[PDB]
Amino acid sequence: DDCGKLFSGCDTNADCCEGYVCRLWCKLDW
């Protein structure tokens, strides 16, 4: 539910919910 965060790297399971990218950071769709 909580999943990854903004800029929070690129975790496996916590692979930051759909919204941001998986670049250097889990930042917004840059």
Structural topology:
Elements: no helix or strand
PDB class: toxin
Keywords: toxin
Assembly: monomeric
Q: What do these coordinates show?
A:
It is classed as toxin. The entry lists the keywords toxin. It forms a monomeric assembly. The entry is titled "solution structure of hptx2, a toxin from heteropoda venatoria spider venom that blocks KV4.2 potassium channel". The protein: heteropodatoxin 2. This protein has 30 residues and is low in regular secondary structure. The termini are far apart. Helices cover 0% and strands 0% of the residues. It is globular. It has one domain (1-30).
Short description:
With 30 residues, the chain is largely without helices or strands. Helix content is 0%, strand content 0%.
Feature tags:
30 residues, little secondary structure, globular, ion channel inhibitor activity, toxin activity, calcium channel regulator activity, neurotoxin
Domains, number: 1
Q: What is the assembly state of the chains in this entry?
A: monomer
- Assign a percent range to the helix content: under 10%
Largest sheet: none
Structural class label: little secondary structure
General shape: globular
Number of strands: 0
Tell me the fraction of residues in β-strands, as a range.
under 5%
Q: Supply the number of helical segments.
A: 0
Computed Rg: 8 Å
PDB class: toxin
Keywords: toxin
Assembly: monomeric
Entry title: solution structure of hptx2, a toxin from heteropoda venatoria spider venom that blocks KV4.2 potassium channel
